[model samples]
Target: SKGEELFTGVVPILVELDGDVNGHKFSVRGEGEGDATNGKLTLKFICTTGKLPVPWPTLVTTLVLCFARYPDHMKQHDFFKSAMPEGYVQERTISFKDDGYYKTRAEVKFEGDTLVNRIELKGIDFKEDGNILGHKLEYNFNSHNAYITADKQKNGIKSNFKIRHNVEDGSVQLADHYQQNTPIGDGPVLLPDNHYLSTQCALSKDPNEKRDHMVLLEFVTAAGITLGMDELY
Candidate 1:
């Protein structure tokens, strides 16, 4: 229904961003409640001084695409881990390239079990942990192939898909919020959105100097939920 863009925007820091899509915008907290961060999705760069040939946004499309079809490669950042559980901690960091960013690393750890996910522009890494927060979904990603397990959770949390992925050509797929769920499993179970945020990031070299280059992120992602099926089917 709505699309959003996120980046490490035009600031002095070599980082990612928060851009706009479909008249909607995604943002980051310059500061948080207690800690400096809630281990949220950066949506920008952490790379130092590498030069991407085309543009950061251009390459970012490829990264987000991978998860479009295969969520097994996804790292639970904004959408999944935005409000981190009390007993758990999860973190994610990105390495960017003007041609293509190198990789994203994350560990969604909780209750003596952890779901570790890594995504790369070229090479990739993935892991399968039964019942991510007791949702009972299987997960595994390797060699351009992956899937998420689906089951009911103890807390009324569950994952199911009326729509299924069709596999990607390469590093694809890309985060989100409507409501807040903390220590995720604590809540009663509910179905996840088929409309999802798959991740993207960018950073400006200099807010003033490379202003055009810094702020020209045109990446757009919309949640294209299924429609006109059952009545027709």
Candidate 2:
């Protein structure tokens, strides 16, 4: 019942913002499914993240979660949504299964008025760090949903990933970067050559859990932009 209920009940408001502000408007609805009652909790956010350039707004959808049967929850729930200021820096941590172990899984859907721009899924595995006995995991963007117009040639955009062990202590590591250019069958085309925009973090620590792990989801873009009118909610 939890799995079916999880899929049917897990919903998140899709927020769209004007310019690059932190606040947003719920323009659509997204859903997630998982077996939370059995210690399996998978969550996803199928919404756009940043603004595209003029005439075309950049769109991103992210799916994230934690599962008792998997060992990559740390990276599974770790999805980015906004761009940070040139010099700003932030860090986050995610712990699951009462520190025993867990995994994460997600799917993203990016769309425009006429079509779907992109879609992707990421999976990671977490294990204890050799010396510190702390959990560590890694993920990769393995799929894409792309569509291009007749006149535009698909330009592969290079994307990168990074992690900071402790920002105050000055620890940073580059994860990965690669070019992306693929077509989404019968779907909307993606904006060409956009970098990996920044994302804002949403931190949560379940009150009924044992592990003192911290989960953070970061948000990027400008600080003052408003996404929608207040009457919608």
Best by TM-score: 2
Instruction: Estimate the TM-score for candidate 1.
Output: 0.26
Q: Estimate each model's TM-score.
A: 0.26, 0.31
lDDT of each: 0.24, 0.24
Off by over 4 Å in 1: 1-46, 53-55, 58-83, 86-104, 107-193, 196-233
Misplaced by over 4 Å in model 2 are 1-107, 110-128, 131-156, 167-173, 179-183, 193-196, 209-217, 222-233
Cα RMSD to the true fold for all candidates: 16.1, 18.6
